[PDB]
Amino acid sequence: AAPL
Amino acid sequence: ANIVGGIEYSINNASLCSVGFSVTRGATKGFVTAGHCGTVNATARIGGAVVGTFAARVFPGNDRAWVSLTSAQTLLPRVANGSSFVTVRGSTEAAVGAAVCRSGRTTGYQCGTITAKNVTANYAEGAVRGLTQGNACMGRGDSGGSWITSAGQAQGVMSGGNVQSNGNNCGIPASQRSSLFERLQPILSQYGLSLVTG
């Protein structure tokens, strides 16, 4: 999961 | 600039994010967006012009922010959908299984359904708790953008998710996407904002  | 949900803005002439929703705080105009997009006092620009600075944010833990804009900006109760618009009518929260769309500068307007609430994202900077998960696709640059139902109920702003090597999760089946948004309700009360609607 990454910001976007 | 006309402030519409989904459009691009840059922060301190570097990062790009998308506008969430037009809001007001007393006589102050603003828009809500993602907290990871900028730090307090960072400068936001739309089409090369300065429009405002970040007034506050929370990131990580939550992922929220509001930019207060100068008087000259035009707030609109709309979210971009290609060349057309979705009118913002309120912020009733939809439940799991409802259909929802999101608009943002990278993949445009994508729709899908909500699959889970209260999701934790483990970002490199720290955990972001309480996220709602949808399977509409999204890509780098969509962050801060609007999540809204066809009926006009604003749900939240784009936070993050699982992107593949091409920068989005639109080439993977809906069943495998995790696209996460920050709920709008708590950002409006935390900052005392009112949504603009039409």
Short mmCIF file of N, CA and C in Angstrom, two decimals, chain A, chain B residues 143 159-161, unseen atoms left out:
data_model
loop_
_atom_site.label_atom_id
_atom_site.label_comp_id
_atom_site.label_asym_id
_atom_site.label_seq_id
_atom_site.Cartn_x
_atom_site.Cartn_y
_atom_site.Cartn_z
N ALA A 1 0.83 -1.24 0.00
CA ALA A 1 0.00 0.00 0.00
C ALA A 1 0.86 1.28 0.00
N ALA A 2 0.45 2.17 -0.91
CA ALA A 2 1.21 3.44 -0.91
C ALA A 2 0.20 4.57 -1.04
N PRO A 3 0.57 5.71 -0.48
CA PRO A 3 -0.22 6.93 -0.66
C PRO A 3 -0.07 7.37 -2.14
N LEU A 4 -1.10 7.89 -2.73
CA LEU A 4 -1.08 8.34 -4.14
N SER B 143 -4.62 10.97 -5.53
CA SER B 143 -4.72 11.26 -4.10
C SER B 143 -5.36 12.66 -3.81
N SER B 159 -6.90 8.34 -0.64
CA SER B 159 -5.70 8.18 0.21
C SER B 159 -4.65 7.33 -0.50
N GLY B 160 -4.95 6.08 -0.83
CA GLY B 160 -3.85 5.29 -1.47
C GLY B 160 -4.49 3.90 -1.80
N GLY B 161 -3.61 2.99 -2.03
CA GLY B 161 -3.95 1.62 -2.36
C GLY B 161 -2.80 0.86 -3.04
#
